Design a protein around this ligand. Structure first.
Ligand SMILES: [Zn+2]
Ligand SMILES: [Zn+2]
Lengths: 708, 135, 729
């Protein structure tokens, strides 16, 4: 069954294709409404995975060089294997001279289609964490940030290198380990510096990046008594905050000291950049920070030049191999829109909150440093993703956290999509949850090989190889065989990433609408000019509902959100796997009442029963709504009475069913406890319901049965 | 959000203490010395004086004027609240000795208390008239 | 006394055995008794020429030498609510005024009659004291009395670390931290610099002082709005901790380039809002950033006279420091050429002072270590005035046209003195713009307005009255040979920079030729008046001083610093350095001043600076003002070696002998008594060195024998023969 096929291939190969049967003819290949594409998670964790400590077998053809995989034809008599990509016959390495049929290399077993190698040859480089701390914030927010900083230091491996950069009006590069003097290098937060300049003006471990095993005592005292930016903030003006210059010096410090190795630049800001390059807003409170309304009317002259500065640093950091995080906690906006390129081009994190002094941020931040069962971080660095395809398959491009290495080859498609024109991408930061979207193009079985070389948090250099295969469409049942292999959940997300990518680099909904109608006209059953006759198979019937919620989501309709909230939402959507992405587009709704156990219901205002308790899961918030009669017998203070204990099982069932995933999701969702009449029930009413799904479906069927 | 503080004996305009930090001051203290001479036994007890974009606040107690200069956009209500902190401390320490002195800035060492209590102001964490009329 | 005429070729022993006293002006007894102390204010001609024609005929310079801020024993201070001044020229009321109507006084400077206010007016303290200090009212200050601020700027390059000077400087600051002039308002700050500028924050809030480095050399700034210039009293403990730390922070540095220019720009920006005293310690040629100076080859004995700064940078910067009441004192502890001709400008135009310690090293040069020790003691503890201003007024008809000293002259001849130190001497040249036909007396009054270390505006005033004469002979009869030599020394320094060293030397020789030639044409041998019998001797001593000598082994920074001392030291110490006092100290007698109750203090006869006065059988002491050298003969007595030196023979005297031992012999009790009498006549403690024996590589004692011959300088008798040939041409 083709649903078991989808789940078993995502669990083993970390891959979700929009189509699992591919077109064998050029006409159907170009008449492909939804592109042949895959949601690929390079480092998806596995329950029974054994590290393979040997160099990967490589096809002995200079152009091919594909990794030995369970799709190759082997001859255990002649010690010979035939490559499945170019058919070049290869002598087995001397290390495989004794391999047998009863005992085969693990790389040839179908259960190890996804396999990881450990390449131990060169001396391992330690991890690097550079804290870039903003001091323009109230002491409550500063001390709380300091507290959660010293907590992250306590989790770092002793061999890890740490640096500290504090900034406000000026920026300070601290040289830790100094005795009796505690010295730092002060720079003007109004002039941008190149990496060569910073190297000259400053003079394995540095004076600024030292092993936490030998300077954590000196750091915990500096961090402990770090104080607010000393410069006075006049009445009616913002603090002078040089966030753009502070970043370029954090980037430049690592560029001239530890290039081409793993390192995280962690910038903690409590407001927008109001000075120097990267400026987001002027320093007068009377003129507000730019909104989407201001962006449309060109009443925001800082966002264009401010963006160019940060995407310059982003491409500098991605070329050097470093990752950039942004932890923004402020009551007002902070400039994520202009700075989003730094954690987006790299694999960096983006965390947003109202204050560092909240349980929301402090727990979100310690989730960055969660360890596995070996006590090692769940982060990887310096990833190089090279994709090899069969002679038919060409790569259009990748959507997600990556940067093109611009390596040309025969598998590079001329029709570029997103980060294209290459078969290799650099992902400076990735976790077991990082998900790319690769888009393919067809110009028996077709094979694709994903090779991800990265630096593990332990210092080992590893190579994860994933070789997949999908059947070519047999031409006597071409459209029928392909239609049954449709993955409507994957296609909707893969099409969503296309829409978001065009919107964030600009009408988008017109393209989204026409592709939905074309998909209805090709794979739907109907008689012409009778909308009542349109029906979708079990393979497609959920796709229109997904598009209905996508074209109304905050990812595409950005007004009613601040420009930083739209960047934040899109940031996390371009990295998540299928499960969490569907939750983002279409929230999940569970019901709680006396009449039955909890159960999922539909996202419609016919489910907001007064008699029930709802559990809504948007990826970004977990809400528990209390109906009319529900809020009434709760306001009555009747849970405390002992003869209604079934009472207590109802009001705390969603609270208990919230905590278990309120701790697994990396960006800890906001928690809500609202009822009817409360001002926080708006989030439920807006996600619930052109007009509505009923009206949307009628218009879709009216247009799907008329002219194509 | 910026500064100029002066304390003078109202009878003769004799300076007692002051606090000034630049890194203008030439024109702005000259009119403070001019107002210090115009004050007498008939002057308003508490007054606020506007110099275009700047603003004067002064109080007079025990024949001692406590003047502060500051641009207009500063909260008037808190400006008097700090001059209360100055007048109280001065009256405690040298209020017994202010009709006795004759040398200018006899209590110039009081400057060590003026800048510290004003950093407790410049940081967030009565009559109306124009100066060109009084002079 | 004597209206007598001297022939300098027959006497040849014209120097007295008693110290030279300044000539008493030929004034009435009741007027001279009120005249100011001559060491505070003196004139080259105690008898002022009536006309400019008469002054030109004498070929002698007319000018004043003054020591306005000298430490006084008794200073009358009047706190009058009002101050009395001539309403037309603002001359302060002075003893040399004349009261006419007992309600009207006749100012002695501009001849406008003024009314005395209702506030026996003739014998108020302002008319009974030429030297007097006033309490300035509120209109004599442009701002509240500034606090005392002391910013120290240390070079900490690799060469600076090797010299080890920072140890003594920091230890001296520790010992004299409570003795710096000031009240509770005392500010202090510290800046170190190598290829970058290092600021230091002092917060009682944190465990350690902070070190903020500014590396942007071409654009310096202040890294913190506070805690850089800290109130010394409230953060005393943290300033002490920094001083105990600085000498050990750069022990293994490898920075060889010094960015002195940028460091001073940063230092200027720091004390710009308040002013104060900037103490700069530099050990090498600045080579990085603005103010960089090119290296220069040092001269030798064969190089002819053949001085000026290389760039105007340190002059422009000093003028910026002057406008913000910032004085820059430059301590140069260099072992190689550092272009002091350009660095010294930072002190010249900021009313600071230059201090020089050639080839300073904490181990190899024990002389400079103890000289920096005693010079830092006086520097850090002597009184000080801030944001000071000085003006010199003279009676109508006399015009000052040239100023000499460390200051900045502004419009209407106003001397800006950001700091005024009690060891600064100034000089002035004046001429007769209009004849003094009507007047018989003229007056000169300097007023020094400053802010004391306690925050009170002061005005120190000196007034000098002199007679006016109308003949050539009377002009010569009132000539001050020492004041003339001093003013001539300052004029030659300016000539050496305007024109060359040879031109400066010719002008010094011609000053004696033309003057004596004019006297000869007013009367067989070289005939001079009694007042100028020592004129060729002292001018010869000028031409062999380090400032103007030729065929010497002197280096550029040595000569330049010698000229800085000429322009900055008072006259009394120019004479002690140029023509040191020579006494025989191997047999002292009871002919001295056994008056100070229990102390002898003998009075040995002053000997002339010739090796012919020496003798290999005794030991003689030479007083060069700043240092006392005791040459001991190779065949000295057995009594002197053991009873005053504590040594059994000439060969066992230690080579570096930093002081005499206080042995218990009336011979040692003797020699310690007369040396103790000369030392307490001075501000900077003169160390004494008795290591000068036969060949201890310290024979500079003989170069102060300015009456002897060398292969590069004339002897005194040859100098007289050279002068006579030109007086009788
Ligand atoms: Zn191959
Ligand atoms: Zn007058």
């Amino acid at each position: 069954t083709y649903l078991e096929f989808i789940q078993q291939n995502e669990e083993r190969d970390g891959v979700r294709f929009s189509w699992n049967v591919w077109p064998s003819s050029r006409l159907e290949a170009t008449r492909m409404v939804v592109p042949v594409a895959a949601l690929f998670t390079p480092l998806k964790e596995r329950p029974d995975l054994p590290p393979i400590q040997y160099e990967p077998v490589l096809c002995s053809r200079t152009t091919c060089r594909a990794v030995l995989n369970p799709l190759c034809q082997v001859d255990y008599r002649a010690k010979l294997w035939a490559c499945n990509f170019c058919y070049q016959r290869n002598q087995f390495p001397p290390s495989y001279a004794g391999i047998s049929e009863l005992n085969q290399p693990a790389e040839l077993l179908p259960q190890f289609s996804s396999i990881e190698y450990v390449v131990l040859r060169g001396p391992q480089m330690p991890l690097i964490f550079l804290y870039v701390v903003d001091t323009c914030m109230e002491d409550e927010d500063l001390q709380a940030l300091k507290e959660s900083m010293q907590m992250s230091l306590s989790l770092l491996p002793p061999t890890a290198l740490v640096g500290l950069i504090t900034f406000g009006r000026m920026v300070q590069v601290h040289e830790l380990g100094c005795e009796g003097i505690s010295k730092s290098y002060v720079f003007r937060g109004t002039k941008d510096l190149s990496a060569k300049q910073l190297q000259e003006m400053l003079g394995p471990s540095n004076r600024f990046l030292q092993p936490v095993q030998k300077i954590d005592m000196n750091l915990t005292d500096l961090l402990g008594e770090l104080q607010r930016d000393p410069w006075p903030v006049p009445q009616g003006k913002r603090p002078l905050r040089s966030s753009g210059v502070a970043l370029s010096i954090a980037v430049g410090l690592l560029e001239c000291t530890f290039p081409n190795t793993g390192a995280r630049i962690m910038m903690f800001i409590g407001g927008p950049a109001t000075q120097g390059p990267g400026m987001v807003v002027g320093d007068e409170l009377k003129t507000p920070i730019r909104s989407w309304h201001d962006i449309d009317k060109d009443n925001a002259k800082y966002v264009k030049k401010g963006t160019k500065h940060f995407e310059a640093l982003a491409n500098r950091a991605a070329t050097t191999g470093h990752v950039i995080d942004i932890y923004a906690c402020a009551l007002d906006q902070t400039g994520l829109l202009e700075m989003k390129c730094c954690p987006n081009l790299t694999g960096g994190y983006m965390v947003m909150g109202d204050s560092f002094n909240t349980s929301l941020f402090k727990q979100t931040f310690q989730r960055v440093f969660t360890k596995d069962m070996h006590g090692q971080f769940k982060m990887g660095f310096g990833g190089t993703l090279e994709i090899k395809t069969s002679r038919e398959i060409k790569i259009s491009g990748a959507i997600g956290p990556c940067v093109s290495l611009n390596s040309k080859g025969p598998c590079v498609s001329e029709n570029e999509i997103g980060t294209g024109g290459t078969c290799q991408w650099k992902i400076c930061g990735l976790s077991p949850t990082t998900t790319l979207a690769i888009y393919f193009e067809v110009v028996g079985r077709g094979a694709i090989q994903f090779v991800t070389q990265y630096q593990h948090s332990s210092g080992q250099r590893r190579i994860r190889v994933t070789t997949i295969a999908r059947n070519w469409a047999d031409a006597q049942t071409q459209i029928q065989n392909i239609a049954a292999s449709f993955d409507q959940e994957a296609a909707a997300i893969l099409m969503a990433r296309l829409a978001i990518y065009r919107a964030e680099t600009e009408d988008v909904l017109r393209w989204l609408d026409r592709q939905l109608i074309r998909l209805c006209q090709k794979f739907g059953e109907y008689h012409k000019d009778d909308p009542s006759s349109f029906r979708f198979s079990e393979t497609f019937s959920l796709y229109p509902q997904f598009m209905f919620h996508l074209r109304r989501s905050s990812f595409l309709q950005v007004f009613n959100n601040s420009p930083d909230e739209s960047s934040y939402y899109r940031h996390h959507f371009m990295r998540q796997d299928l499960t969490q992405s569907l939750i983002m587009i279409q929230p999940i709704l569970y019901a709680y009442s006396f009449s039955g156990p909890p159960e999922p219901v539909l996202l419609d205002s016919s489910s907001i029963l007064a008699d029930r308790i709802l559990l809504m899961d948007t990826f970004f918030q977990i809400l528990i709504y209390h109906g009319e009669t529900i809020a009434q017998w709760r306001k009555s203070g009747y849970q405390d009475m002992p003869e209604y204990e079934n009472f207590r099982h109802l009001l705390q069932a969603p609270v208990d069913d919230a905590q278990e995933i309120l701790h697994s999701r990396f960006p800890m969702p906001r928690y809500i406890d609202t009822e009817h009449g409360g001002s926080q029930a708006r989030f439920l009413l807006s996600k619930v319901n052109d007009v509505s799904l009923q009206v949307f479906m009628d218009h879709l069927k009216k247009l799907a049965v008329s002219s194509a | 959000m910026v500064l100029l503080t002066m304390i003078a004996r109202v009878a003769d305009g004799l300076p007692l203490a002051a606090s000034m930090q630049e890194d203008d001051l030439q024109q702005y203290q000259s009119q403070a010395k001019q107002l210090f001479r115009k004050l007498n036994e008939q002057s308003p007890t508490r007054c606020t004086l506007e110099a275009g974009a700047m603003t004067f606040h002064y109080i007079i107690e025990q024949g001692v004027c406590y003047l502060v200069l500051c641009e207009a956009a500063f909260p008037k209500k808190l400006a008097f609240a700090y001059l209360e902190d100055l007048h109280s401390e001065f009256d405690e320490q040298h209020g017994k000795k202010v009709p006795t002195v004759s040398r200018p800035y006899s209590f110039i060492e009081f400057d060590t208390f003026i800048q510290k209590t004003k950093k407790l102001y410049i940081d967030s964490r009565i009559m109306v008239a124009n100066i060109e009329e009084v002079l | 006394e004597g209206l007598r005429v001297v022939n300098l070729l027959q006497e040849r022993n014209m120097l007295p055995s008693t110290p030279l006293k300044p000539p008493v002006p030929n004034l009435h007894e009741d007027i001279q008794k009120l005249n100011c102390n001559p060491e505070l204010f003196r004139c080259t001609l105690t008898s002022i020429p009536q006309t400019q024609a008469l002054l030109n005929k004498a070929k002698l310079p007319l000018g004043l030498l003054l020591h306005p801020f000298k430490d006084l024993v008794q200073l009358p201070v009047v706190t009058s609510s009002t101050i009395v001044r001539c309403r037309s020229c603002r001359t302060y009321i002075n003893p040399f005024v004349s009261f006419l109507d007992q309600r009207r006084w006749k100012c002695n400077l501009c001849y406008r009659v003024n009314d005395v206010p209702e506030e026996e007016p003739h014998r108020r303290p302002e008319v009974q004291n030429a030297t007097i200090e006033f309490m300035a009212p509120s209109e004599y200050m442009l701002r509240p009395p500034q606090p005392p601020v002391y910013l120290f700027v240390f070079d900490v390059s690799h060469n600076a670390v090797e010299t080890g000077y920072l140890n003594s400087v920091c230890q001296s600051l520790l010992d004299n931290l409570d003795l710096l002039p000031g009240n509770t308002r005392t500010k202090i700050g510290f800046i170190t610099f190598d290829s970058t500028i290092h600021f230091y924050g002092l917060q009682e809030s944190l465990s350690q002082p902070q070190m903020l480095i500014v590396s942007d050399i071409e654009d310096v700034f202040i890294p913190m709005p506070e805690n850089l210039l800290v109130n010394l009293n409230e953060s005393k403990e943290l300033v002490q901790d920094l001083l105990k730390t600085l000498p050990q922070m750069f022990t293994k540095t490898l920075e060889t380039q010094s960015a002195l220019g940028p460091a001073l720009q940063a230092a200027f920006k720091l004390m710009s809002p308040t002013g104060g005293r900037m103490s700069v310690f530099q050990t090498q040629l600045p080579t990085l950033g603005v103010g960089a100076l090119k290296p220069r080859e040092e001269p030798n004995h064969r190089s002819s006279a053949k001085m000026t700064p290389s760039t105007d940078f340190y002059k422009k910067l000093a003028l910026d420091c002057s406008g913000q009441q910032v004085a820059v004192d430059l301590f140069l502890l260099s072992g190689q050429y550092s272009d002091l001709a350009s660095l010294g400008c930072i002190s010249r135009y900021s009313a600071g002072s230059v201090y020089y310690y050639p080839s300073y090293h904490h181990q190899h040069n024990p002389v400079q270590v103890q000289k920096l020790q005693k010079e830092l003691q006086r520097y850090l503890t002597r009184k000080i005035g801030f944001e000071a201003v000085m003006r010199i007024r003279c009676t109508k008809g006399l015009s000052i046209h040239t100023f000499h000293g460390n200051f900045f002259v502004r419009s209407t001849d106003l001397l800006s003195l950001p700091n005024v130190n009690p060891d600064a001497g100034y000089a002035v040249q004046m001429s007769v713009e209009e004849s003094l036909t009507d007047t018989q007396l003229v007056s000169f009054q300097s007023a020094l307005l400053y802010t004391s270390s306690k925050g009170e505006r002061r005005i120190r005033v000196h007034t000098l009255c002199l007679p006016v004469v109308s003949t050539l002979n009377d002009v010569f009869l009132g000539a001050d040979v020492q004041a003339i030599s001093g003013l001539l020394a300052n004029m030659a320094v300016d000539r050496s920079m305007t024109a060359s060293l040879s031109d400066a030397r010719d002008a010094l020789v011609n000053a004696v030729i033309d003057s004596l030639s004019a006297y000869r044409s007013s009367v067989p041998g070289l005939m001079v008046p009694f007042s100028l019998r020592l004129f060729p001797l002292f001018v010869l001593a000028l031409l062999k001083q380090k400032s103007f000598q030729t065929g010497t082994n002197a280096r550029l920074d040595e000569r330049i610093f010698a000229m800085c001392q000429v322009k900055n030291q008072p006259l009394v110490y120019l004479m002690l350095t140029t023509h040191p006092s020579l006494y025989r100290v191997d047999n002292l007698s009871d002919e001295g001043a056994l008056n100070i109750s229990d102390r002898t203090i003998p009075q040995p006869p002053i000997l002339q600076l010739s090796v012919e006065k020496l003798s290999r059988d005794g030991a003689f002491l030479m007083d060069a003002g700043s240092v006392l050298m005791l040459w001991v003969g190779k065949n000295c007595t057995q009594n002197f070696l053991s009873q005053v030196l504590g040594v059994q023979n000439y060969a066992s005297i230690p080579q570096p002998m930093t002081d005499l031992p206080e042995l218990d012999t009336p011979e040692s009790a003797r020699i310690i008594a007369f040396i103790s009498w000369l030392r307490e006549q001075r501000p900077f403690f003169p160390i004494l060195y008795v290591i000068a024996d036969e060949s201890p590589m310290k024979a500079n004692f003989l170069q102060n024998m300015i009456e002897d011959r060398t292969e590069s300088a004339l002897s005194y008798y040859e100098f007289l023969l050279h002068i006579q040939q030109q007086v009788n041409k």
